[PDB]
């Protein structure tokens, strides 16, 4: 879109409707006349537009109003209500902007933020923007969390996030306008290479790929159209669904073959009965012929009975000869039909070993996107964010993704090397007990009004608990935390001294020998200016490869590389790096996925803040003290970076509203 509708699009909003949120903040408007609604909408879209058209500076209300046109600049309180609503939930003046109105002289309320991953940083920048006292507690010795960038000399490579899944409606667009990011397009073409080092033929490539997509679509059809969603009492996973679809394909193939061969049989039997007929016929014709000759022997003159006998046998014989010639025609026809059938046999098989191997590679690609064995994905829901895709081509950050968290942490109070060990939230406030990660006896206590918890769902999943919650999280939130899924996925950075791959190829594959090992080093990326190749490990393999030393792993790597490129072409890597996210105790995994039995609903549960019981009994139910943000909390965009950032913005809005009060709802 373009114009103000463009802005409403870019901000993930319907230009012609009031969202549920806007309904809540402005219930006078929606319940009122359509005209006014339209006014409102335009005001929203136009502001949006303004900020978007220049997100390097703060967009003040004065500025907004100044650039508004009649009649839309008449009801100034409406303009103000809007401007504030937007500023609040960080649809504007979010990220890194030169502040027009310098920060408030004296702060208000105190918020402790666990983790300075992206969600963390984002919220914190907002809360600070709104004038609170924010402080962040990072276990690590660096920011970003699951946004991690390796750098040594000019070698630079993301072990964390790496891709910008499209700019259409991506907040990260804005951020990129704000932050110097070297974004680069991803050339979608991806050659495959079987285990041997032989490229896979385009025929094979496309046929397999297509059958794959068709399989997927099949599962979907199974799911929604057939309500195939509970085999046993267990829910069904994408894995099992695919397996069934496939088995039905093989079965169908066998059915085809059988029908065909049976046609051939039936025809053969027709031929048999035909032949029998023809043979008995020839016998009768032989005997007749004999008799006719014997009757011809009787030389004239002859009485008429005799003449009748010759004429008779001659007639009969010519008859049977006729009949036999017909039968021979019929035999001709049956025979050529049998050649036809025997010439057009249905497909021999459904999938060959090479086929199934390549298919397995496509599945490995799927398991990689979701960072989990397809045996675990929920058949029904695994693709539920699909309806919120950003548009545009997916990109990579040439100068390391970390450039963003770092940029976000400017001006923030961050405490590195601080592992939080306990969260204590009460009617009257919260205290958070943390230790110094270097010297784990050195203890810290932080007291505050509210605690924003951007702890990786893995860390929350931990048993026994990495972080203790006092009082315990309630059964509903824990259960949500148990039901959801957290996946695993790892990368191997290879730093050589010169490029021996195809510099016009951004990514290429390696087809796994088996099904089990399909994730095992199945894919490579050249995205960087430097001679750096990136190997991926996903699926089942990603969890097992963590129990194997670096050297072995880079071994298998260089092995496959040699097999594809040749032994006298693959130098030793000057530098080598291997991620183990499922091991990292500040992560415990890669990102989340919708495990079978889970749904989006649980993402919403994860977002719901906690309200502590009353101190004095018979006291009014308090303010909510405990807030969650982070990638695992945002139903419509999980497991991403934009996802995080949004959750952060969201909670910051929520928190602010709670403690500083929302003046825009009247």
């Amino acid at each position: 879109p373009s114009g103000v509708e463009g802005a409403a699009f870019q901000s993930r909003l319907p230009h012609d409707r009031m969202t549920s949120q806007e309904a809540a903040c402005f219930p006078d408007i929606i319940s009122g006349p359509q005209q006014t609604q339209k006014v409102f909408l335009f005001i929203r879209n136009r502001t949006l537009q303004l900020w978007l058209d220049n997100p390097k500076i703060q967009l003040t209300f004065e500025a907004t109003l100044q650039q508004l046109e009649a009649p839309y600049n008449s009801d100034t309180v409406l303009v103000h209500r809007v401007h504030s609503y937007l500023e609040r939930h960080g649809l504007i003046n979010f990220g890194i902007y030169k502040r027009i109105k310098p920060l408030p002289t004296k702060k208000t309320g105190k918020v402790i933020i666990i983790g300075s991953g992206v969600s963390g940083l984002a919220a914190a920048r907002q809360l600070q923007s709104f004038g609170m006292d924010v402080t962040l507690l990072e276990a690590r010795d660096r920011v970003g969390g699951r946004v991690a960038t390796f750098r040594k000399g000019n070698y630079v490579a993301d072990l964390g996030a790496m891709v910008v899944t499209g700019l259409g409606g991506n907040p990260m667009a804005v951020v990129s306008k704000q932050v110097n990011m070297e974004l680069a397009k991803i050339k979608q073409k991806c050659p495959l290479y079987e285990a041997n080092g032989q490229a896979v033929p385009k025929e094979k490539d496309e046929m397999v790929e297509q059958e794959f997509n068709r399989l997927l679509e099949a599962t979907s059809y199974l799911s929604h159209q057939l309500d195939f969603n509970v085999l046993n009492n267990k829910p069904v996973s994408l894995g099992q669904a695919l397996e069934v679809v496939i088995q039905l394909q093989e079965k169908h193939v066998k059915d085809e073959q059988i029908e065909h061969w049976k046609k051939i049989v039936k025809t053969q039997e027709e031929l048999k009965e035909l032949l029998n007929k023809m043979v008995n016929l020839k016998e009768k014709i032989k005997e007749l012929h004999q008799q006719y000759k014997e009757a011809s022997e009787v030389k004239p003159p002859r009485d008429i009975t005799a003449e009748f006998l010759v004429k008779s046998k001659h007639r009969d014989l010519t008859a049977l000869c006729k009949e036999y010639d017909e039968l021979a025609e019929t035999q001709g026809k049956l025979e050529e039909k049998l050649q036809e059938l025997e010439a057009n046999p249905p497909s021999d098989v459904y999938l060959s070993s090479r086929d199934r191997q390549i298919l397995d590679w496509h599945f490995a690609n799927l398991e990689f996107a979701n960072a989990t064995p397809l045996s675990t994905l929920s058949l029904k829901h695994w693709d539920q964010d699909d309806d919120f895709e950003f548009t545009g081509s997916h990109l990579t950050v040439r100068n390391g993704y970390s450039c963003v968290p770092v940029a976000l942490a400017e001006g923030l109070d961050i405490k590195l090397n601080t592992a939080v060990r306990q969260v204590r939230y009460t009617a009257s406030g919260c205290e958070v007990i943390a230790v110094n990660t270097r010297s784990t006896s050195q203890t810290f206590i932080y007291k505050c009004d509210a605690v924003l918890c951007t702890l990786p769902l893995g860390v929350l999943k931990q048993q026994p608990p990495a972080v203790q919650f006092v009082p315990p999280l309630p059964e509903w939130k824990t259960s949500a935390v148990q039901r959801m899924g957290f996946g695993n996925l790892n990368k191997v950075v290879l730093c050589f001294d010169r490029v021996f791959w195809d510099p016009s190829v951004n990514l290429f594959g390696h087809v796994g020998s088996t099904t089990a090992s399909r994730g095992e080093l199945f894919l490579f990326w050249n995205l960087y200016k430097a001679p750096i190749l990136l190997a991926l490990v996903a699926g089942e393999a990603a969890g097992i490869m963590e129990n194997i030393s670096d050297d072995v792993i880079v071994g298998r790597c260089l092995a496959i590389l040699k097999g594809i490129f040749g032994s006298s072409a693959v130098p030793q890597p000057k530098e080598t790096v291997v991620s183990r996210w499922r091991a990292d105790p500040w992560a415990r995994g890669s990102y989340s996925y919708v495990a079978a039995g889970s749904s989006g609903n649980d993402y919403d549960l994860m977002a719901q803040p906690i309200t502590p019981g009353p101190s004095i009994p018979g006291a009014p139910q308090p303010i909510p003290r405990l807030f969650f943000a982070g990638e695992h909390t945002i139903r419509n965009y999980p497991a991403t970076v934009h996802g995080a950032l949004l959750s952060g913005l969201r909670e910051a809005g929520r928190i602010a509203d709670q403690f500083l009060g929302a003046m825009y709802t009247l």
């Binding site: 979608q188 997927l216 693709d383 964010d385 699909d386 895709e389 497991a639």
Partner: peptide, 10 residues
């Protein structure tokens, strides 16, 4: 592609 656009979550 498919799903799927290109490299999304699904």
């Amino acid at each position: 592609x498919x799903x799927x656009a290109f490299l999304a979550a699904x």
